[PDB]
Amino acid sequence: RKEFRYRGYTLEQLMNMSLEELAKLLPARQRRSLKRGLTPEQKKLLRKIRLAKKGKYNKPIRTHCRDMIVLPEMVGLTIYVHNGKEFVPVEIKPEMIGHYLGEFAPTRKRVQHGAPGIGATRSSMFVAVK
Amino acid sequence: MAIREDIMRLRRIRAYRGIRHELGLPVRGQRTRSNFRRGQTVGVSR
Amino acid sequence: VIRVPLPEGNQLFGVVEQALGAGWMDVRCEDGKIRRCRIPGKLRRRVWIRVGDLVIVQPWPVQSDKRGDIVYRYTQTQVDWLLRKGKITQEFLTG
RNA sequence: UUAAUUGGAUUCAACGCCGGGAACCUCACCGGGGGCGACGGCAGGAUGAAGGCCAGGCUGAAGGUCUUGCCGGACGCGCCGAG
RNA sequence: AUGCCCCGAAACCCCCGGGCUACACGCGCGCUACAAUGGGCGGGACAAUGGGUGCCGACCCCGAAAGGGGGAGGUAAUCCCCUAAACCCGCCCUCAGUUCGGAUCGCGGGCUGCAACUCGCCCGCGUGAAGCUGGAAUCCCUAGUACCCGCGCGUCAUCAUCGCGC
RNA sequence: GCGGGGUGGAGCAGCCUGGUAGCUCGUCGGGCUCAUAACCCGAAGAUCGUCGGUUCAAAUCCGGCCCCCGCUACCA
Numbered sequence A: 001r002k003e004f005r006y007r008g009y010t011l012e013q014l015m016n017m018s019l020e021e022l023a024k025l026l027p028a029r030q031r032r033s034l035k036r037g038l039t040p041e042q043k044k045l046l047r048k049i050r051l052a053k054k055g056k057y058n059k060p061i062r063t064h065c066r067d068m069i070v071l072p073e074m075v076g077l078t079i080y081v082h083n084g085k086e087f088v089p090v091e092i093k094p095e096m097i098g099h100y101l102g103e104f105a106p107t108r109k110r111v112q113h114g115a116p117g118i119g120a121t122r123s124s125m126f127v128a129v130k
Numbered sequence B: 001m002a003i004r005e006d007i008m009r010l011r012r013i014r015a016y017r018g019i020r021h022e023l024g025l026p027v028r029g030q031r032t033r034s035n036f037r038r039g040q041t042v043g044v045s046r
Numbered sequence C: 001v002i003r004v005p006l007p008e009g010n011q012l013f014g015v016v017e018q019a020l021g022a023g024w025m026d027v028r029c030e031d032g033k034i035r036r037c038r039i040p041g042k043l044r045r046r047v048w049i050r051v052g053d054l055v056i057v058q059p060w061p062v063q064s065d066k067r068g069d070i071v072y073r074y075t076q077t078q079v080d081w082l083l084r085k086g087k088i089t090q091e092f093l094t095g
Numbered sequence D: 001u002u003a004a005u006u007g008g009a010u011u012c013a014a015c016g017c018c019g020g021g022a023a024c025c026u027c028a029c030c031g032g033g034g035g036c037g038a039c040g041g042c043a044g045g046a047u048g049a050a051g052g053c054c055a056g057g058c059u060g061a062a063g064g065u066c067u068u069g070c071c072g073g074a075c076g077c078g079c080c081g082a083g
Numbered sequence E: 001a002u003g004c005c006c007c008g009a010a011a012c013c014c015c016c017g018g019g020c021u022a023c024a025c026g027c028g029c030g031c032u033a034c035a036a037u038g039g040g041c042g043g044g045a046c047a048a049u050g051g052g053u054g055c056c057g058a059c060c061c062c063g064a065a066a067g068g069g070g071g072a073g074g075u076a077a078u079c080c081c082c083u084a085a086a087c088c089c090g091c092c093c094u095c096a097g098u099u100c101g102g103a104u105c106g107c108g109g110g111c112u113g114c115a116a117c118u119c120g121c122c123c124g125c126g127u128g129a130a131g132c133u134g135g136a137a138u139c140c141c142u143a144g145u146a147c148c149c150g151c152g153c154g155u156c157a158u159c160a161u162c163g164c165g166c
Numbered sequence F: 001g002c003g004g005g006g007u008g009g010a011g012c013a014g015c016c017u018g019g020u021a022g023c024u025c026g027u028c029g030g031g032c033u034c035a036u037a038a039c040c041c042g043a044a045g046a047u048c049g050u051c052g053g054u055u056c057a058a059a060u061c062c063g064g065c066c067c068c069c070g071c072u073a074c075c076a
């Protein structure tokens, strides 16, 4: 219980596995996305992760495609996302494969509440507007 | 226990479906301007 | 950023104590001398001023003692907003 | 509360109302990137303006710019008024 | 459609990602219940308005279910949507927070889409919250009308607790 | 002489005749109204100064005590 096993297959046991034999080990949504092909932008992004995986492209990977499905290629490195105004780092670990990329870059600031004002109740609605 | 560890697993990686489990809020995309009032009333003046 | 009635020109900050009557407002500013604000006629219609409302006024170079004149008010979304910037210290309102 | 949580309507006669069940568009809102001056005159222009591309950087992605040099064959927001 | 005043390399025109779906809280209109004037399981009965060529799909075959692979006939009183539900008979439950009530959550399978995390809809197993008839107040209805039960168009690539009709 | 008040933000009930801590001005919410005051309704708020006895069982019977006290004056 220190190694990670997804469906009985270790990381480097599945790291060399294919992409059509892979999808039988993912839930519906990701199996279907892997079956209607990848979008053009995600092609352009995989063709920048693989270079950054061999020896080249030692430069921060950025993106707008929050839809990309994490895969056994991306385990280990640290890529960015775009949560609306800025690029936020997501250090990819195992136990993320299957989830969505944008799933880890939240998008609305947590809310903390002040105090009710003029109109929050029927006792301060017409007693203010004269 | 199995459900609990399936929740902790989402708490680790800091997903979006794990933080809602943290703060005790809806999880499956509901709206909350109007329902889910598990708190206590607030006053202004009288 | 934000458009707030800062001191522009020679403006003053009016935080009133009592309305003696007929529009006279004794104001308690950080300056010290008892100033007595009065009101123009453009706002006497649509707005509603009382005590505790920190607002902006304008003083007059005559005797610099009992002066002030409303030109614009403050809404509850600004009166305490103006604390974090420290543009005004609220302890000129509790002593 | 927020980077933005776009606006109009407040008794009858405002609140499943604007045919408003908004993933993109609709979109008017916050972050970023790029294009647009019929027409009269000005610096300039066949010793070649406006204007376009294989490949590579910057970039979220882009001949959008720059590196690189190829092409096209008359006009000209680099300047003023107008539209 | 339109007068006046501001923008005029921008407040004009396109493209990618976010928001309108944020949540201590007050309110308007509705849907499901608090059970016997009922819940479940197996059988038996009877409609009307409307719509279809970017579309409606009979019939056959795979699947437990959502759905999938083929595919006649239809530019319409011809073919299709389209053997409705409340109702009846037979057996289990017997007044209990229950065989009432199904919110909230975990895992797995699918459809539309250029794209389902923020934020779509549908299926199977599991967990099983408040709720035991509602204070002062207030609304709609005079006959095939009120109440009770289902259906069709609109919006629509998918999604109806809504609007307008039966 | 020594004894009393010991309790919601408060004001006092409320004993002996023991089992709702009780009514009123206040506090926040909702009604009524074109809107405000008055009027109707709902919840929140001390849980009896405290140990101890009685008591099946206590503001409710009382004592011990902690606090506030309290009706009262040089006594040649």
Ligand SMILES: [Mg+2]
Pocket (backbone or CB within 6 Å): none
């Ligand atoms: Mg949009």
Ligand SMILES: [Mg+2]
Pocket (backbone or CB within 6 Å): E020
């Ligand atoms: Mg809205």
Ligand SMILES: [Mg+2]
Pocket (backbone or CB within 6 Å): none
């Ligand atoms: Mg049931």
Ligand SMILES: [Mg+2]
Pocket (backbone or CB within 6 Å): E116, E119
């Ligand atoms: Mg989704």
Ligand SMILES: [Mg+2]
Pocket (backbone or CB within 6 Å): F036
């Ligand atoms: Mg009133």
